[PDB]
Amino acid sequence: SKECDFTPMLVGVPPQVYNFKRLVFTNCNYNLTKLLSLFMVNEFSCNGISPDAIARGCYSSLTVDYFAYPLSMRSYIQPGSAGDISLYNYKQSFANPTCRVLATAPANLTLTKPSAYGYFQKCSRVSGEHNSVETPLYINPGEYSICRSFSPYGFSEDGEVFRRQLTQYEGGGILVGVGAKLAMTDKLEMGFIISVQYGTDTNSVCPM
Amino acid sequence: SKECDFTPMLVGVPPQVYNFKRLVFTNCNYNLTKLLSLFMVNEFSCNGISPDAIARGCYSSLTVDYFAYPLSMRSYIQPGSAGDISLYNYKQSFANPTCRVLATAPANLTLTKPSAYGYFQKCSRVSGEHNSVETPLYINPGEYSICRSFSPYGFSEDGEVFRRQLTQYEGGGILVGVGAKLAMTDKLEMGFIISVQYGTDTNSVCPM
Amino acid sequence: RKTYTLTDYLKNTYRLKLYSLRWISDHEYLYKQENNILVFNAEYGNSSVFLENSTFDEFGHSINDYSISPDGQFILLEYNYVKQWRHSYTASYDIYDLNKRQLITEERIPNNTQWVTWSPVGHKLAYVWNNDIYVKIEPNLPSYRITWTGKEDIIYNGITDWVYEEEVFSAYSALWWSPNGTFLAYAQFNDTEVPLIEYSFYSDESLQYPKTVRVPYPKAGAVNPTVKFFVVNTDSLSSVTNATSIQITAPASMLIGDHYLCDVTWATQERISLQWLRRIQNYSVMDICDYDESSGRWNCLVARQHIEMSTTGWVGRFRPSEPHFTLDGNSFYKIISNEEGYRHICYFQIDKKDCTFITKGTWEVIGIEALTSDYLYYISNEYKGMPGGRNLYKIQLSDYTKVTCLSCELNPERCQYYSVSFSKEAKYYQLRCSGPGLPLYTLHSSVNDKGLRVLEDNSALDKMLQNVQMPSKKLDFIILNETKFWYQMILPPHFDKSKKYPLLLDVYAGPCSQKADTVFRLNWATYLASTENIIVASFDGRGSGYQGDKIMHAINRRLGTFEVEDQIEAARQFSKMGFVDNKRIAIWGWSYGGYVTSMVLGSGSGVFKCGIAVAPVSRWEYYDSVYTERYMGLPTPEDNLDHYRNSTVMSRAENFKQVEYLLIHGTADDNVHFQQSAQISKALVDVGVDFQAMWYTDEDHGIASSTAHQHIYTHMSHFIKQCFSLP
Amino acid sequence: RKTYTLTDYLKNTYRLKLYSLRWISDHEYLYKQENNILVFNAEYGNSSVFLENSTFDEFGHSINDYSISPDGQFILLEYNYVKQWRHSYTASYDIYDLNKRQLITEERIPNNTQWVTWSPVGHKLAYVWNNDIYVKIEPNLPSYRITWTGKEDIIYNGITDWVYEEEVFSAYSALWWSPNGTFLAYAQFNDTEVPLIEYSFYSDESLQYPKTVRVPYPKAGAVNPTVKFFVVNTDSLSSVTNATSIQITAPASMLIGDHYLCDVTWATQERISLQWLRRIQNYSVMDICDYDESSGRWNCLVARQHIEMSTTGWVGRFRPSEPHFTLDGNSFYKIISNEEGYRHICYFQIDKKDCTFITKGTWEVIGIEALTSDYLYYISNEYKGMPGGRNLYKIQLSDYTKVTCLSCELNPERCQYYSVSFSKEAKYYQLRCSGPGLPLYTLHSSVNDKGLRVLEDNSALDKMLQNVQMPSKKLDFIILNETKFWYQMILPPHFDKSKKYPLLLDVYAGPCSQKADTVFRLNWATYLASTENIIVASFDGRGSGYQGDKIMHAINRRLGTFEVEDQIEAARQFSKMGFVDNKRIAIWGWSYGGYVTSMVLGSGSGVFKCGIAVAPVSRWEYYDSVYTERYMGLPTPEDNLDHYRNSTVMSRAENFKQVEYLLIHGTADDNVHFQQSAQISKALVDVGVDFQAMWYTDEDHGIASSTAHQHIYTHMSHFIKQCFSLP
Numbered sequence A, B: 001s002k003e004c005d006f007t008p009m010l011v012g013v014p015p016q017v018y019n020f021k022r023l024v025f026t027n028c029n030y031n032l033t034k035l036l037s038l039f040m041v042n043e044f045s046c047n048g049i050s051p052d053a054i055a056r057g058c059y060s061s062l063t064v065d066y067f068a069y070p071l072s073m074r075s076y077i078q079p080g081s082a083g084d085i086s087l088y089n090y091k092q093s094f095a096n097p098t099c100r101v102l103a104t105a106p107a108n109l110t111l112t113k114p115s116a117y118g119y120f121q122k123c124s125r126v127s128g129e130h131n132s133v134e135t136p137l138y139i140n141p142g143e144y145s146i147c148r149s150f151s152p153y154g155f156s157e158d159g160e161v162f163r164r165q166l167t168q169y170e171g172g173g174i175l176v177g178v179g180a181k182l183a184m185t186d187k188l189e190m191g192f193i194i195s196v197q198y199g200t201d202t203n204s205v206c207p208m
Numbered sequence C, D: 001r002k003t004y005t006l007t008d009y010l011k012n013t014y015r016l017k018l019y020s021l022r023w024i025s026d027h028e029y030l031y032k033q034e035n036n037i038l039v040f041n042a043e044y045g046n047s048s049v050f051l052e053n054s055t056f057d058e059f060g061h062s063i064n065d066y067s068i069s070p071d072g073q074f075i076l077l078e079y080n081y082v083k084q085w086r087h088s089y090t091a092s093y094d095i096y097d098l099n100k101r102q103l104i105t106e107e108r109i110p111n112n113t114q115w116v117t118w119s120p121v122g123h124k125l126a127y128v129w130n131n132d133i134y135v136k137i138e139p140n141l142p143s144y145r146i147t148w149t150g151k152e153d154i155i156y157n158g159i160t161d162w163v164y165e166e167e168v169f170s171a172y173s174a175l176w177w178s179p180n181g182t183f184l185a186y187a188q189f190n191d192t193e194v195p196l197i198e199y200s201f202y203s204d205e206s207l208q209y210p211k212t213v214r215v216p217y218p219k220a221g222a223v224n225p226t227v228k229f230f231v232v233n234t235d236s237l238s239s240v241t242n243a244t245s246i247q248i249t250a251p252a253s254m255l256i257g258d259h260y261l262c263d264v265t266w267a268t269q270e271r272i273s274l275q276w277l278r279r280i281q282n283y284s285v286m287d288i289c290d291y292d293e294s295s296g297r298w299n300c301l302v303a304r305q306h307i308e309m310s311t312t313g314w315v316g317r318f319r320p321s322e323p324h325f326t327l328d329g330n331s332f333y334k335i336i337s338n339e340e341g342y343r344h345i346c347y348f349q350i351d352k353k354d355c356t357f358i359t360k361g362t363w364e365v366i367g368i369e370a371l372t373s374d375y376l377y378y379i380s381n382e383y384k385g386m387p388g389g390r391n392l393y394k395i396q397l398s399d400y401t402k403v404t405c406l407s408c409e410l411n412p413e414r415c416q417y418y419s420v421s422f423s424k425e426a427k428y429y430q431l432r433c434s435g436p437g438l439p440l441y442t443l444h445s446s447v448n449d450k451g452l453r454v455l456e457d458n459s460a461l462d463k464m465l466q467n468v469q470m471p472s473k474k475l476d477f478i479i480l481n482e483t484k485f486w487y488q489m490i491l492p493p494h495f496d497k498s499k500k501y502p503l504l505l506d507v508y509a510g511p512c513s514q515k516a517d518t519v520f521r522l523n524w525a526t527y528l529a530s531t532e533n534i535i536v537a538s539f540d541g542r543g544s545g546y547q548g549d550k551i552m553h554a555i556n557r558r559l560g561t562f563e564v565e566d567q568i569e570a571a572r573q574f575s576k577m578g579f580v581d582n583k584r585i586a587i588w589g590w591s592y593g594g595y596v597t598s599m600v601l602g603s604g605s606g607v608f609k610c611g612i613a614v615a616p617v618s619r620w621e622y623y624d625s626v627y628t629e630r631y632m633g634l635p636t637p638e639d640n641l642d643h644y645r646n647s648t649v650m651s652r653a654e655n656f657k658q659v660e661y662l663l664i665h666g667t668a669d670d671n672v673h674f675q676q677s678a679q680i681s682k683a684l685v686d687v688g689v690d691f692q693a694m695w696y697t698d699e700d701h702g703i704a705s706s707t708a709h710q711h712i713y714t715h716m717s718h719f720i721k722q723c724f725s726l727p
């Protein structure tokens, strides 16, 4: 049977947190212990499943969000945190059982480190008679910020200010975004959000 | 018996023509065919000995002057030439039988190429009531220019002008020198002047 | 009896006396006297000595200034003063311990320091050096470097660039301490793409090749500098790892384009108010930011933003006014232009849109001076319906209809222009009356507004001035189109209204200017009247402030149109009064007055025989962005370029063939560059207009060197006396 | 009858006529007339038409100039002229074929070309572009690039830097063709370490931020530029590999320190003469170099060097004179200062040290004009013992005692100042008489010195001038310490020596100047005399040339000492003559005259009421090295710094309290920088001296713009009329 292909997470420059990538694994078999052992995990926090058991269960569909995330900012990603990072970059969805993995990648891993860490520290929409009305734009859990289009791959410097007008499909107005740039680290620090589901053909995704 | 050590000619940066180096070989045995075959000779011009026979004779003392010399300026070193190079840099002595060797050095030879070729295009001494008297200083055959002290290893640029006062041992006055800088070439081009002598223990320096 | 000669003015032979004091508590203040600082008891008046200047006979350097810490334990000594611009300068600094009575020599403040300031309470120091901010908790301890990004002429941490210093903040510093000294808020400026003005500086005889000075200076429409705002916690500074500055961004209604930071006002120990202004300066926003103790950052709620925009012109007189918060910081008082067009006090709430005007009328509140829980103290030009005066009122916060004037009728003959200085709880207040009579400084107690004692009454000058023929000041108004336009007249002594005097029009006419007030002045006009029998007159026409927005905003996007005509009409009104010789009417001005003086002389009105313009603006595209754009917009075909073109002095060069003109400018003028006058002289020569010029070597905008200030006013006096056939 | 008004001078209503001609052979010349070039037969006078200007009605650009090739096959057309400095400029160039009557469009000369020149015979071209030299054998063929090292403001191949252009060569080019056009000799200049002068340039109204101009300019004592000399064979130019330039070094008696290249004179087709000058300009050497056909290089023999040094001052009048070689080039004639102190012709041999003076007397040979095998033609100031005149003599080479004046008594009343232009074999010569009468151009034939015909006699002006009251020119001398010091006086019409006129001293006093000559001039002095009844006078004191070295070298290392006193004494001599009102004596000067005018006014002599100085030198350390050091040495404590200090105008600022002073200077002066006048105004203000100033925007040293030239002389006229109470 097909083995769940975890390659895209392990090659090249991993995406920034606000512009993350996801992999729906449907109808394949997985070895998750192998996946996590390639890195060195500093956090493995699971909500709605014991972390032991997620490597063992059979799921209708397993999803994984991956992105580059410094262990420096661990507290801003904990469930129910109040940072710009859960307002404007990434918010964990708890409708399905989920697992949060914060890991450092070794030198002898095939991932390339991006220039620096970045995240949006402001994302709000300007409308009104004289562009007087500011309307902050917070993300729904597990969805993408509209600001990620401004600069998908990172920020040249700290405090980058962006703006553009929103098409009438986007609902008019002027979108404004500000980007914080955090300096990079010694070894690449990465974040993984693993979601699972049960239901139609619960056996579609089973371990090895 | 001791073998005539031709190593100093073959290592490092060879001297400039005006600041050449010489090797008196007394009481050793030599293989000259080996020496010349390390290079690729473009001129082998002997005056007072057939070039064939100089590799075979037995000499009281063999001397060799070596220096870096472009084949571009071959005509200025021919016997009785009128260039600045025989006035101010080097002049072949014919009192003893001698051989002139102009050769290109291969890439796989242990010599390092100096930055460029250089030679003095003016060397004259200034004296008089108001430094009015100029007295050009031409070299006697096989001797060194007094200007070589100004810049022994080469010239940073073309037309370098030098001056200094001459100590009362040197006979007063102000020495003035001008240096021509010729651009260097693809492979190192070198010059050898081999002089021999006969007399006291004519067998001191014999072939192999 | 003698007359007030030019030598009297230029050599300061009739000096005024002041009374300057720092309130160090709510019932004490410091006053220096014979170099020995004295600490007065505000209530009783018994004053012991704080510090005697002979302490520093040992110092070895000439001390420009001193600054005693709020806790009184240390004194900051300033020396090696080197002026940069209007406000900026560099100097070296020594901290002297007052308790140990010793100079501190560990971890000394560096040389060439750009700004120093104590914490508002205690003895912390914040100083700027190489465009970087350093915090010094104890004067004998190492500094904590806050910013690492300072760069000459590029990045300014904690200090202003040229245009923010001059046209926005009117100060060098971009430092704002928290009220109890916990937080240090600061601005960062970035002139990376701002064009440089370049002018020759010749120093002295010795310097063989002149310096070329290069100053980042955005002229009209150019690239403006960009500004960021930060807050740092000065209590949590660690010496092992670098300190964090939390950025505060501007509201998104400002990030959509170029903007300015125009006000920073702390409300509480954990709340700060910022005001931002669009580059088109008819829309401003106040952001109110609370410090989040659980994330360490600052939350500025959108529901707490406050939009102050104008539909007839620019926001504020020169900038949006500052807010005066209550103690709890949940409400604030602020001067706003009301629905009628007059500036009055409004009472906002931090989270509610509307405000309540607590004053109203056909007058303007000049400024909010003090605010207690029971009373709000303000200064306005309401008394006798005179915009030229100033008086101190207090309003009862429990009943806005009960208002009390505290300075109106103290001495209404001599005293009509008042400024005030309150104690730290507003328990006592010092009134300063600048005119029309000799200045008078007095103390009062706020609980009863009781007049305690006279501080300085200038009677020393009063006895001196008896032996000299002083001129008198007529202040009145004329009505044009049923609007009162005010004017003043320095009338020579023994003025005879049946005689026809020559007149000299002293003009500024800048937006929101006021050259017709009640203030007492000894200046060049006093010489011209007392000694040379010349009527000096000033006029406040369209564009002049303090008279309502209908008058002040009348020149919006039309600089050099109405205020130029109105000064010509003022001359006509004066000439038809009768006591003015219309053959001899002149005009003179300095910065906007120089611009207007030249425009008037190029107007071809035939009214003025001669005029003299120092350091004048000639084309508004040559002046800085913040000021010019406030009134003119951008010089683009889409915005206002057509009037930018049709407002130049050079355009009028033909019409100087009728007048006698004198053009004066300093060769090292950082503000109204010598370029401006260079272009006028070019234009006059191309059209074949003869005129007189005078360049002042290495001089700045307001010529301040002693020898040059004497020389200019001497030269100008000869020009006026030649123009009037005066002896 | 009317008077010669200022408008007559400024609008050129009484124009002089010239007769300019290029001798294209030994018996033909070119003359342009109504834009149509005419070729005259020198002997007979019958003149057919060379080229009609309507040929270029098709061209489409305004043509500044034309230059027909020596062979007459091509014409070089100049347009897009852009002046750089006194001599330098850039322009675009088109070559028009005269035979095919077509414009050449293959391989066109680039734009912004700095110098172009034909070969002396034929149609080769040498042009400089981006400081690099290009040779163009055929006008329709590709250029051969000679030099690859040209760099803006750093390396100059074939053209001069600022100071070589202005103070050494008096020309932009550093190109010297071989006599038959085989060799192209050129100089290379290297300003790598020369300091830059920087001044503001404001262009026009549109330019928002001014340009800052930066020009490599060595002031007194600074780093001088360094010079190299090369020769290239233009016949052996190959298009496959780059061309060789053979360097010619200076003699070692020059390489021991800083030096200058001051003369390049080809002797034969294979021999060239170079003259080098020590930076201390009292020692020069001529190097004579023959081309070695067997090595391709150039041999300059030491036995052929020629040392020309001076013991009382600097070598030459402004530079060592040029040699006039014989045909074979083995001997040459050259003007030398003889043992008596007078400049006369010496006859050197290329390989023999001594020379033979062929002229001698108490007069100077001004220049060698032509040299045939039988006669040498020279110009001297010998006639009537007048240094102020010029006359053409020829000397017989077979007998140096036989000398003939060819211009003395042609018309000795009207004509006393002559210049000449010979044909290519000196078979005919055109005399030009510049004064005292109206200019007169005539043709002559050398074999008999026969007067052939009158070319231009200015009788058109003569009839015009009948209806106007012209002033007269008195030229005389006075004796001080038994030395004749000459002077001139523009006397108003109907001059009455029993009346006492105001006087205005027109002063230059520069080393080797001569302001007292016989030349005819219509200028500002003519206005001042004819219309304003003012005697304008000039004087030639110590330092003035053409009167011997005892007079000219009298100011050596002491600029601003004797010539300043001597101009004051001249005023005293004139005032005690009687017809001069000593209440009204003024003084005016421009470059060294401006320096002397200021020095005289700061002298405290009490002699001059008022003075006006345009673009004046104020301190000699501000002026360029080559000129200042020629007369002053170096400003080091070892050489002359003490007098460099004690010769400044700023030192005398106190003594302007007695005089009325007007200071005028251009803001874009590349030569006497505005710095100089800026320092004077500074000094006057610090000492509290009132004066009048006038800056001229974007103007150079000799103010040449039409509007500014009119404006200045109008302003100056008002100053003099005010100073004399004139109507």
Ligand SMILES: *[C@@H]1O[C@H](CO)[C@@H](O[C@@H]2O[C@H](CO)[C@@H](O[C@@H]3O[C@H](CO[C@H]4O[C@H](CO[C@H]5O[C@H](CO)[C@@H](O)[C@H](O)[C@@H]5O)[C@@H](O)[C@H](O)[C@@H]4O)[C@@H](O)[C@H](O[C@H]4O[C@H](CO)[C@@H](O)[C@H](O)[C@@H]4O[C@H]4O[C@H](CO)[C@@H](O)[C@H](O)[C@@H]4O[C@H]4O[C@H](CO)[C@@H](O)[C@H](O)[C@@H]4O)[C@@H]3O)[C@H](O)[C@H]2NC(C)=O)[C@H](O)[C@H]1NC(C)=O
Pocket: B013, B115, B150, B151, B153, B154, B155, B156, B157, B158, B160, D149, D155, D190, D192, D193, D226
């Ligand atoms: C237009 O005019 C300009 C101004 O007049 C001209 O510009 C000048 O050009 C000359 C050369 O023509 C330069 O001199 C050379 O400078 C070299 C480095 O200079 C750089 O640094 C300058 C700072 O000034 C100080 O700093 C350097 C430190 O590196 C110091 O050495 C130097 O002396 C000076 O005090 C900076 O301002 C410059 O811009 C440069 O970037 C310097 O190394 C040269 O010394 C050389 O050459 C001389 C004579 O040739 C010898 O006596 C020295 O010993 C030394 O020789 C070594 O290096 C040479 C290569 O350059 C080789 O030829 C030699 O073989 C030798 O190498 C061996 O020798 C070593 C011992 O010396 C051994 O230990 C090694 O093992 C090596 O084997 C020389 O001083 C001027 O600096 C330059 N000035 C300016 C302002 O630019 C310009 O040329 C003119 N242009 C035209 C087109 O006309």
Ligand SMILES: *[C@@H]1O[C@H](CO)[C@@H](O[C@@H]2O[C@H](CO)[C@@H](O[C@@H]3O[C@H](CO[C@H]4O[C@H](CO)[C@@H](O)[C@H](O)[C@@H]4O)[C@@H](O)[C@H](O[C@H]4O[C@H](CO)[C@@H](O)[C@H](O)[C@@H]4O)[C@@H]3O)[C@H](O)[C@H]2NC(C)=O)[C@H](O)[C@H]1NC(C)=O
Pocket: D180, D181, D182, D235, D269, D270, D293
């Ligand atoms: C402008 O002025 C220059 C000189 O400044 C003239 O240039 C010289 O012109 C002469 C012609 O009169 C040239 O001399 C002749 O050269 C012939 C040989 O030419 C080549 O020779 C060798 C090749 O083997 C090359 O190395 C060399 O460079 C030449 O390319 C000779 O045959 C001639 O000599 C004959 O006459 C003499 C007596 O006069 C006899 O003794 C000889 O044996 C022989 O019979 C002759 O010498 C000379 O080479 C040119 N030199 C240079 C540097 O240019 C220009 O001609 C002149 N141009 C104009 C338009 O006026």
Ligand SMILES: *[C@@H]1O[C@H](CO)[C@@H](O)[C@H](O)[C@H]1NC(C)=O
Pocket: B106, B108
């Ligand atoms: C030098 O190197 C060449 C190859 O590049 C080789 O053929 C030759 O034999 C070598 N000679 C010596 C002396 O190393």
